[PDB]
Point group: D2
């Protein structure tokens, strides 16, 4: 047992911190107010090296130099303190797009699609959810028929796709057989700009305004057999396994939003003077701050636990589920308390505290709701 | 003991309901998105009669005809289901402006200022809070000096004033002596358009976008002795007592927002089909709905309790405190759960569920935070 | 609407308060530690007329003179403050025995059986639960075979019977026809001492030590045709409707336990000093006390509302369900908190606060676990 | 970072598990019901070498061979699953007695006093609390007067001493100088049987029945100069630093209780059936179980993190504080829930689930109430 970070992990931590401080911190309030997805920040982010933390140097990563999942995770958490929208933009690329190519991809697919993503040359997306396939990821309407070419044709739509529009490489799931549903989904790689491949209306979301969420529409889109990721009919397995990893990302995002709120409330409590005393002098305030701190620490070691488990090659399915949920709930509790400590000022979008509360809410929903997290843990528990 | 509504109460209930259905419901999403304060809706609202529910016919009200506090409250709750921003606009006028004139005003002040407000001819506001006087309503910088005329001069600012800008009659509190602070605040009536009396920047708030919140600035504003509401140095008493009543309004607002969320989640649970079943078929969903319903009912009888106590002439200080807090907390719990039940769709500002959550948050803050509500109840408890 | 107790309601309340003060309070710690059921005290309680509060004078009750369900509920609450176990022995009789004979019995069965329960010359009990039928009421295995004599022969047993072994008149449900389970259960008035009617295991329980809980055994118990309550097959309906009323009583007991715990905590926080200040002057303490008070107030008005609807003849199944779950959930919370305020002393069985915690847990389980109340409420909600 | 137990850690864990399985489990219900402290079992436990896990071979411990604080913590957790009262008698010795002699004692005092505590030939206890000094440690009234012989005379008493009346070696704190309270407390090694050293009230407690809690009485107790631990005036520092470690143990015990309650609930939900389905197939049940599991995981990693920092020599006061409050708060929750899943049977002292609830409450109060942990953490947060 050990809870000390390696120097390498600290490098990736400090890395995102400096960026978050000099680039993200100043413009976040503007960008969130206007809902601006700043492609230039993303490009700067992507060139930092964080994207290839745990990937082998073979593909242009720091994996062979001591980088690991926890490094990448630590960065996600750090970025989420400054800008949650950007934090999830990064997390989606690595955990949900690069990873599955890296895991289930052939060397050709890796050399072609993985290395750009690892090197920060391209951005990735994950297109699984659609109107009738939410938590039930098998009510998928999207069809993927085979042609005499040996190529496939996709027809469908995807709803709520993070990084949609802005992304270059999309991992898309389609039903190659709608009889064995759960055993008949196939994963495909789509490049931005494929004929027939279009985008729909942009999502009008409650918070996380710096992240771009958009619909995708597939209209007779023909892709080569080469773009098929993994075996035909093994798509559900691929989605679930990559979602296990992503859950650690969302957990880490939730954690960062929470630490953001605590930091804000702590420094505010010392400056706001009412009844002649700074807020921190009133026992209730102090105790709210201490309790928030306890929850944040509780979530923390669970998030890190999962990242370590993953990098070790140990099954982390339940651990991720646990980290995602405890982290998301903490985020929501801690964030709602933070606004309260700021009084009326917390209700103003001039202050950072309101934003955090709005952001906390998606972490209980996307990448599998907290209820599925209950499903994954209980299923394990009852075996 | 009796928990049946009078027909008169049901009249005022049905009244706001029809309005909320035909006028508020259609445009709320637009107005909230754009932050539009629609003066025309307010004018329609004000002519409904709700404003004079518990005021004697003497002043143009329904008080002598069987109208009472609970009637006015029931309407507030009802409007809050459709539009929380409009709900608080109404509540502020009656509870926080008309009432104190009605309670501490001379007949001249009533005939001049009360009857318009009661009849729906004018809108009122309550200007107590300022930068250094939040929960500590005695760090008031606003000065009110006496002149050789016998008239007074006001210099100051007020922050976060609901109905600010839009209102006609403002109840403003100023320090006539800054030595006996808590015993040296005086209440004054200000008419919109008084020279020196200006407004500052409009509040950029997290939710409740349909309510207009603005700063007021007093620059050498001279008012006649006639505009002094109550005795000099008795302002704190007047603010507290009127805040006791308003707390029932905010409680009723919180209740309505909660019922709004429950209604949404209930009908959604029946339409959203996942895994082949509507959401309401999964035990967890049903139980979330049932629990939400229990909290809403718990808050409810507490809100009504306070309104009845007030109309009876019984001291309702603690009851209001209890209603305000339990209602606000329920609103926040129930509202956050509602978004969860809607999945990703709840995170979209296209759906009503996100709005409700954003609104719930002010009810724990304005008109005295939930912590002061703890202060008022515990103070009583330890006597 | 009206939240005022009547003269009569206050009389029954005062009545129970003096019995609690004089007869219950001085011995409760002894009786609880030793787990004794004092038949003399119960016979004393029964002689006060509380048992007849809402039944008509023609059965020996105060119903014809202004006594109502609430008066009886106020009594149960009051007794619960002193001795939770005694409160329930009483609640069981009136709500689970006298009520179904009154509500379903023929005038004959009323003259014979109801009169003594109302007058207090006999105690009653409700036998429904079996080892294979707790929450699943339909799992009845006790059979009620019909004989040539138009007689019945009961064979089976009942588990966890409050007042079991100490009651005179029992209401037992048995399967007359096991084809139509939930439509084939029959209720019978079974008298203690009937040949074949034996008692078994006396339950050793965590709390509520002053209440006797016993197993009933039916070995070839012959019952006359005029002991059938209702009619063949409507025994489930009878039990269900009986349980709605019984639940209002349990909600009341739960309320009473919470009130006792709050009062102990307030009184103690005034006296105990640390750091040179009485406990009540530390803000976390006074806030704790305040929250407790708010919760019990939330539960209170739900308890009373349910009692009034029953006495008014309105449908109250759901109000009973909300009351029981909120009141007990509040009890469990306030209870666990009062022990905390007492510190090391709250963990000592010398002080009363641990007993209140032990007692509080049962209010969540018996007369329908809180989860059943959620089932009841949510089902009504989805109708 | 690393969350892997070592071979040695697993050895001490297995060790405690077999003692629990063989010696503790079969008699626990009897011993708990009768409130007996079995000296033979304790002497058995002490002979396993657990007591010496992290102390060096020169005192008879396994510290020089890979035993560490965590190994001892794993033991405490494990024992707590079977007998919470036994777990704490052990925790008290190692953490509250052997540790301060080791950490503050001279080599002489170590050879004499530490050796037997490490070897397990004597039991130890920690006497700090007084009726006028619980949370306010500074309220010490026991005086330690100096004599011509360079000797000390202790006069006073101590309340609530775990292992009191059964311990050989005691650590008592007494005011050497009452001017500088918090800077004038002194620690002394006091041996059982020293003339003047008597015992008093044996506490009758709600739970943890297998633990002996007794009052210590000091009437003219002469102590030799070389029994002073530390030096005049630094007894508060000693006690504080002793309590940080002790708290990691209490967090562990609390963890163990929670784990026992979860396991009972899982095992039961698999077997018990209602409505024709095993309890674990109703979604509210499996979700409950899942949440419980998540909470205990949250607490687990906080408990272990604190243990590692202590063994690593990092500062751990706050980690101890977070661990103790989370673990106990989780215990109280999981505990109250497992009783619910058992239904009517969970309320019976035949089953183990009620004991776990009774035991869980003390983990929130002793070795520093959770409110103190909040004080500790929040203060460090506002530095
Ligand atoms: C950037 C972003 O923001 C990303 C987005 O949010 S991504 C969109 C998020 N959407 C979701 O998370 C959907 C949530 N739903 C799910 O994860 C799943 O549908 C579910 C957990 C509900 C389970 O569904 P289910 O149909 O009951 O399947 P389940 O019983 O779990 O497993 C079915 C099969 O898949 C296999 N499987 C499940 N999980 C697996 C895993 N992690 N790895 C491999 N195989 C797995 C099972 O072993 C089983 O295989 P066999 O039938 O061959 O034995
Ligand atoms: C539409 C909207 O959105 C409206 C807005 O939100 S309105 C702005 C909301 N702002 C607030 O609610 C401020 C909250 N703060 C307060 O209410 C108070 O300052 C407080 C509760 C914190 C108490 O402050 P305090 O200085 O400690 O005074 P407190 O001890 O309560 O009472 C002081 C005096 O006032 C009197 N007083 C207090 N409450 C009173 C009441 N309800 N009626 C009459 N007198 C009262 C006390 O009896 C005492 O009088 P004496 O000294 O003459 O005996
Ligand atoms: C002293 C003490 O401590 C007291 C004791 O605890 S005794 C109590 C111990 N046992 C319990 O509390 C039992 C808990 N279980 C229940 O309440 C029920 O089993 C339940 C609520 C879970 C529902 O079970 P179910 O089998 O699904 O019944 P359900 O289908 O809802 O209803 C069956 C029929 O009875 C009727 N019914 C149900 N509840 C009713 C009510 N409150 N009033 C009237 N009729 C009712 C239904 O309308 C239905 O009629 P039809 O069959 O003609 O349509
Ligand atoms: C078997 C069992 O069941 C065990 C039992 O329960 S025994 C435990 C029963 N009693 C307790 O748990 C006591 C609870 N109370 C406390 O812990 C403390 O009183 C407290 C945390 C509330 C603080 O009290 P306080 O009087 O405010 O002390 P505080 O001012 O913080 O500290 C006093 C000094 O000691 C030092 N100190 C405090 N905590 C310290 C720590 N953890 N490590 C080192 N030094 C510490 C401070 O730095 C300070 O030094 P200076 O005076 O030189 O500046
Ligand atoms: C900002 C945002 C970004 C997203 N980004 C992506 C992305 O990049 N890629 C992608 O593919 N998807 C993405 N999504 C979609 C997201 O993952 C889904 O919204 C989420 O998985 C929930 O699906 P749903 O909205 O259909 O909820 P539903 O499945 O309709 O569920 C609704 C509610 O019912 C609950 N529920 C459902 N089934 C059960 C059951 N059997 N038992 C109990 N409770 C149940 C759910 O937990 C939820 O509370 C995103 C969504 C948002 C809002
Ligand atoms: C949308 C909106 C509308 C409003 N409308 C009006 C209006 O119409 N009229 C009006 O006059 N005002 C109005 N206000 C102001 C509002 O009532 C105040 O914001 C509120 O009373 C809190 O004051 P504050 O913001 O200064 O918080 P602060 O007083 O700074 O308090 C900040 C935090 O510390 C807590 N706190 C403060 N003192 C203590 C203490 N002693 N012990 C423990 N906790 C403490 C508070 O509860 C809060 O959590 C409005 C505010 C908003 C956001
Ligand atoms: C002291 C005491 C006195 C009692 N007195 C009486 C009395 O006088 N008369 C009488 O007839 N009975 C009496 N009972 C019985 C009592 O009402 C039952 O214990 C209760 O109905 C629960 O049934 P059970 O114990 O079989 O638990 P179960 O029915 O097994 O329930 C166990 C757990 O599973 C949950 N559960 C069960 N079914 C579901 C489902 N479908 N979905 C979700 N969760 C579910 C329950 O809520 C609970 O958490 C008494 C019990 C006690 C302890
Ligand atoms: C079974 C048992 C075993 C024990 N074993 C030992 C042992 O071996 N050795 C030993 O020395 N002691 C022991 N104790 C004592 C124990 O640690 C004390 O009970 C504990 O420190 C609390 O002190 P108190 O009981 O005086 O309660 P109090 O100090 O009166 O505290 C009472 C309540 O007020 C709260 N409170 C107190 N001060 C404040 C404040 N400033 N702000 C906010 N809230 C506050 C507390 O958190 C608690 O809720 C034991 C106790 C028990 C019950």
């Amino acid at each position: 047992m050990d809870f000390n970070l390696t120097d390498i992990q600290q490098d990736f931590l400090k890395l995102a911190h400096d960026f978050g401080e000099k680039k993200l911190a100043p413009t976040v309030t503007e960008r969130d107010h206007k809902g601006i997805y700043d492609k230039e920040l993303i490009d700067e982010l992507l060139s930092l090296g964080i994207t290839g933390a745990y990937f082998e140097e073979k593909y242009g990563g720091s994996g062979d130099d001591g980088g690991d999942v926890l490094s990448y995770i630590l960065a996600v958490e750090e970025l989420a303190k400054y800008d949650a929208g950007v934090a999830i933009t990064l997390s989606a690329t690595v955990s949900l797009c690069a990873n599955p190519i890296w895991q289930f991809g052939t060397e050709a697919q890796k050399e072609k699609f993985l290395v750009p993503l690892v090197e920060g040359t391209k951005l990735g997306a994950f297109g699984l959810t659609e109107p009738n396939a939410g938590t039930d990821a098998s009510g998928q309407q999207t069809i993927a028929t085979k042609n005499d070419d040996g190529t496939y044709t996709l027809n469908g739509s995807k709803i709520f796709i993070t990084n949609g529009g802005a992304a270059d490489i999309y991992i898309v799931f389609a039903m190659t057989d709608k009889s064995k549903g759960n055993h008949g989904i196939t994963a495909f790689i789509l490049e931005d700009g494929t004929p027939g491949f279009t985008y729909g209306k942009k999502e009008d979301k409650m918070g996380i305004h710096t992240s771009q969420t958009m619909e995708l529409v597939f209209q007779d889109v023909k892709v080569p057999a080469e773009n098929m990721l993994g075996e035909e009919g093994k798509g559900f397995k691929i989605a679930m396994m990559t979602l296990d990893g992503g859950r650690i990302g969302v957990a880490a995002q939730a954690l960062g939003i929470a630490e953001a709120a605590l930091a804000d409330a702590v420094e505010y409590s010392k400056q706001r003077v009412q009844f002649g005393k700074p807020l921190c002098k009133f026992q209730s305030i102090s105790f709210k701050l201490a309790d928030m701190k306890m929850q944040i620490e509780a979530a923390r070691n669970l998030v890190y636990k999962a990242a370590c488990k993953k990098q070790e090659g140990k099954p982390f399915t339940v651990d991720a589920a646990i980290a995602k949920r405890v982290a998301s709930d903490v985020a929501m509790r801690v964030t709602t308390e933070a606004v309260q400590i700021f009084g009326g000022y917390g209700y103003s979008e001039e202050y950072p505290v309101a934003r955090h509360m709005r952001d906390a809410k998606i972490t209980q929903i996307y990448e599998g709701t907290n209820e599925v997290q209950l499903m994954v843990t209980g299923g394990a528990l009852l075996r």
